[PDB]
Amino acid sequence: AVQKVVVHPLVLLSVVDHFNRIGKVGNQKRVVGVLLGSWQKKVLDVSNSFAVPFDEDDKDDSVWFLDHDYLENMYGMFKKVNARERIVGWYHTGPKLHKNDIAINELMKRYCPNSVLVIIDVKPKDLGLPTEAYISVEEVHDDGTPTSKTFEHVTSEIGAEEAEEVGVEHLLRDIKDTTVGTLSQRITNQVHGLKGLNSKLLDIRSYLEKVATGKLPINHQIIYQLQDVFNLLPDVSLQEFVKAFYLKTNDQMVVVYLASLIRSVVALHNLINNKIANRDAEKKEG
Amino acid sequence: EEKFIVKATNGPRYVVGCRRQLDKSKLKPGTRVALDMTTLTIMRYLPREVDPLV
Amino acid sequence: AVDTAEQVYISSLALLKMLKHGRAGVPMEVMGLMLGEFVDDYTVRVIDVFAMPQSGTGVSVEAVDPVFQAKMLDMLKQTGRPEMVVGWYHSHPGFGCWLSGVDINTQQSFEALSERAVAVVVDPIQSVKGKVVIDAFRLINANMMVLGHEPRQTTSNLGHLNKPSIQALIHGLNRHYYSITINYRKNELEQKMLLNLHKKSWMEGLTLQDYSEHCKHNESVVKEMLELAKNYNKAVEEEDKMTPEQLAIKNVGKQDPKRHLEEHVDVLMTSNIVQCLAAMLDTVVFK
Amino acid sequence: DLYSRYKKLQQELEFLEVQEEYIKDEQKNLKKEFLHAQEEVKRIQSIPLVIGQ
Numbered sequence: 001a002v003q004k005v006v007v008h009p010l011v012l013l014s015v016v017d018h019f020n021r022i023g024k025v026g027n028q029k030r031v032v033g034v035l036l037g038s039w040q041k042k043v044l045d046v047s048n049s050f051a052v053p054f055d056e057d058d059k060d061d062s063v064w065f066l067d068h069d070y071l072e073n074m075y076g077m078f079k080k081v082n083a084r085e086r087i088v089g090w091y092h093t094g095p096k097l098h099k100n101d102i103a104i105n106e107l108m109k110r111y112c113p114n115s116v117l118v119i120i121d122v123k124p125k126d127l128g129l130p131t132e133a134y135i136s137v138e139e140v141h142d143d144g145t146p147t148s149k150t151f152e153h154v155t156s157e158i159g160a161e162e163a164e165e166v167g168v169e170h171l172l173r174d175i176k177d178t179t180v181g182t183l184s185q186r187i188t189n190q191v192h193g194l195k196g197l198n199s200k201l202l203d204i205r206s207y208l209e210k211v212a213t214g215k216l217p218i219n220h221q222i223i224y225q226l227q228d229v230f231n232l233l234p235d236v237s238l239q240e241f242v243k244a245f246y247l248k249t250n251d252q253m254v255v256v257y258l259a260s261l262i263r264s265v266v267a268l269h270n271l272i273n274n275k276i277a278n279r280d281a282e283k284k285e286g
Numbered sequence: 287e288e289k290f291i292v293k294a295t296n297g298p299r300y301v302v303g304c305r306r307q308l309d310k311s312k313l314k315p316g317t318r319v320a321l322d323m324t325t326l327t328i329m330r331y332l333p334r335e336v337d338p339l340v
Numbered sequence: 341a342v343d344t345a346e347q348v349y350i351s352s353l354a355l356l357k358m359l360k361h362g363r364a365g366v367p368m369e370v371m372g373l374m375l376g377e378f379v380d381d382y383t384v385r386v387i388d389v390f391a392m393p394q395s396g397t398g399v400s401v402e403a404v405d406p407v408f409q410a411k412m413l414d415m416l417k418q419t420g421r422p423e424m425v426v427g428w429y430h431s432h433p434g435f436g437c438w439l440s441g442v443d444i445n446t447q448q449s450f451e452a453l454s455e456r457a458v459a460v461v462v463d464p465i466q467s468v469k470g471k472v473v474i475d476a477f478r479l480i481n482a483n484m485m486v487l488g489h490e491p492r493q494t495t496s497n498l499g500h501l502n503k504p505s506i507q508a509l510i511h512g513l514n515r516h517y518y519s520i521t522i523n524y525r526k527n528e529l530e531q532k533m534l535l536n537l538h539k540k541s542w543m544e545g546l547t548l549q550d551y552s553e554h555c556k557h558n559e560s561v562v563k564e565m566l567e568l569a570k571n572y573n574k575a576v577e578e579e580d581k582m583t584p585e586q587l588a589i590k591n592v593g594k595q596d597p598k599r600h601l602e603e604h605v606d607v608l609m610t611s612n613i614v615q616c617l618a619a620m621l622d623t624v625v626f627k
Numbered sequence: 628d629l630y631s632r633y634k635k636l637q638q639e640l641e642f643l644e645v646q647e648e649y650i651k652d653e654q655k656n657l658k659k660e661f662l663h664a665q666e667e668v669k670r671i672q673s674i675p676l677v678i679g680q
């Protein structure tokens with residue numbers, strides 16, 4: 001149904017406010033906020049959101065506390081001031097997906113339309129993208145397990161339309177723009193290996209742990225496609241790609257001729273002014 | 287092809303861009319279009335007509 | 341009779357709420373209310389900022405519904421927002437950020453409770469996207485016309501308050517209407533969360549997806565940009581063939597504002613993408 | 628004075644040597660600021676505009 005979503009940083013800075021208005025009490029649980037957006041178009045666009053007092057139990061996980069009057073009053077007044085945005089779903093700040101999320105999401109599945117779920121981290125130490133759109137749809141399983149709520153990962157992007165780019169750029173004054181060239185390219189080409197190294201290294205360790213020490217079926221069926229796609233590149237002998245290395249290396253030669261020739265053109269004004277300025281300033285100094 | 291010149295009815299002329307929704311079908315010149323006060327985006331066009339034609 | 345040097349603390353909450361409120365800043369007059377806590381005399385901090393429903397009358401004391409204001413404020417009191425109101429904001433599109441008689445009258449009426457009564461006017465309509473410079477406004481006492489206008493100490497920040505130096509509004513209407521300085525604040529959670537959030541907003545999902553796209557587009561699409569780049573290079577060299585004649589005749593003074601050097605340097609920078617991504621293809625082919 | 632010029636001059640060797648990485652920092656940072664302000668004044672030029680004579 002929905003291919004991609006658009007999440008503005010305003011809601012995540014509202015999660016910064018979720019971490020600001022705590023009051024130093026010692027709970028810091030998965031505070032659930034009422035996510036708002038535009039479900040009209042096929043693409044989802046989050047503009048702003050708000051929160052609702054949400055408290056769980058220490059031992060029992062099935063305890064969840066929501067509010068209907070606060071949702072209808074905040075949504076009623078928010079719709080009165082801005083009717084272009086309506087309820088879409090919710091989101092929790094907890095890093096782990098608990099079992100009670102089917103009951104928490106089930107309320108906004110009954111009263112509200114199909115709600116999207118977003119899992120983020122309480123500490124911004126994760127290098128990866130903090131936002132993951134999880135659609136709440138029921139899927140048929142091939143093994144015969146009963147139909148239940150399944151959270152499929154929907155791709156997400158963090159973009160601002162008109163003003164939040166200006167506000168973020170003015171508040172930071174440290175981040176740089178695209179700036180195609182040497183630095184913005186070589187930084188990605190340096191740290192990219194760590195950007196994949198922390199993800200893969202962080203995932204395959206617990207993966208290999210759950211291979212031998214795993215039960216409660218983790219959908220082992222998708223592991224066959226995992227190792228299949230991993231074995232779709234069986235160390236090609238590079239025999240056919242030699243001519244492609246001749247093409248890319250020939251373009252490399254083109255960049256060699258462009259650099260040497262163009263820089264040789266740049267040497268004109270320098271290697272002329274260095275003489276005509278020094279000898280004339282010297283002969284005319286005294 | 288992406289950004290062209292518009293002529294407002296009031297007399298001053300402007301230049302606008304292309305919206306990601308519409309295509310280059312109606313974007314060809316010779317067709318009266320509509321603009322927005324903010325960002326000068328294009329929502330849709332405006333088909334011409336006449337008084338006795340109504 | 342005493343005055344201090346006050347400064348309005350502006351976090352990203354009120355800023356982004358005034359940016360979304362500026363996106364909803366239609367020509368029709370809008371209303372807003374600022375919240376916060378008063379810790380001492382010469383400092384003021386804003387935390388909570390929300391919007392108000394529009395009305396046909398516009399900015400006025402009659403549009404402010406006390407049961408709606410106190411109702412929403414009470415709903416903020418039952419939540420984790422124990423902050424009292426500190427001021428009200430609005431938008432003044434087109435005619436400038438100055439305050440009319442109605443605005444100064446509802447300001448005079450709304451300043452009876454809070455002695456500070458911070459007033460902010462956002463106007464992103466005619467302001468370019470390069471700067472988001474916003475200014476906070478204040479109300480002066482009518483009985484201070486005999487004595488000095490603003491007996492504010494620490495006159496250093498007035499140099500930073502001189503950035504809005506329009507020659508009609510600031511000193512065109514500065515009588516009985518002055519302003520105050522604005523500073524910001526950012527903790528480490530906003531710095532790393534918003535910094536990594538913006539870097540990720542300019543980065544990819546797995547960060548390895550769109551690399552090979554350009555690494556392999558260097559052979560299909562960039563080749564056209566390299567041929568056209570050489571067409572501009574030769575298109576300048578055809579004049580650089582004529583340059584050594586003038587440089588061989590006059591050698592005195594410069595008349596052409598074109599440098600012919602930095603543009604070719606930029607062309608070399610765009611041409612170095614093949615070199616920088618060749619090692620990327622070497623890594624993808626290797627492992 | 629004759630032999631003191633060596634060790635006294637070493638202080639000038641260190642004071643002039645310390646400026647190398649400093650001018651490296653200035654020449655590497657002020658051009659980053661040059662492209663920052665360059666793109667900042669470049670992005671001011673917007674496509675929507677009025678045409679005069």
Ligand SMILES: [Zn+2]
Nearest residue numbers: 369432433435
């Ligand atoms: Zn007005």
